[PDB]
């Protein structure tokens, strides 16, 4: 269907590709290496429960007062 040149990526000569840099002494920084710096939220979960309760309650209070 397609020629071998198109498959292998070169007509006559295979050109050298410059390898990827590593930056020895530190972690790689790529779009896929970000969980090393940003994990899932784990510090303020209980505060999340409390604040969701208080938000629901205060909103319900003011909505009922407005409606009434």
């Amino acid at each position: 269907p397609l020629p071998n040149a198109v498959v292998q990526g070169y007509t006559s000569v295979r050109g050298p590709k410059r390898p990827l840099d590593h930056f020895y002494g530190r972690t790689p920084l790529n779009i896929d290496t970000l969980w090393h710096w940003v994990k899932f939220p784990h510090r303020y979960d209980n505060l999340r429960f409390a604040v969701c309760f208080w938000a629901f309650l205060v909103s319900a209070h003011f909505a009922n007062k407005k409606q009434r």
Binding site: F56, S59, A60, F62, A63, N64, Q67
Partner: protein, 54 residues
């Protein structure tokens, strides 16, 4: 949503419900306009009755 009691939006809001304030303003204006006339009439009647008898 829980406090409103409605899942779509508030109730008793809208120009149909806001216009009732202006309707009340006009109704009170008319009511005071008629009440002043009626009170003046009744006061004239009472001042007549008193100055005739007393």
């Amino acid at each position: 949503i829980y406090g409103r009691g409605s899942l779509y939006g508030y109730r008793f809001d809208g120009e149909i419900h806001r216009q009732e304030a202006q309707n009340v303003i006009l109704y009170k204006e008319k009511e005071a306009q008629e009440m002043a006339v009626v009170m003046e009439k009744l006061e004239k009647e009472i001042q007549e009755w008193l100055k005739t008898m007393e």
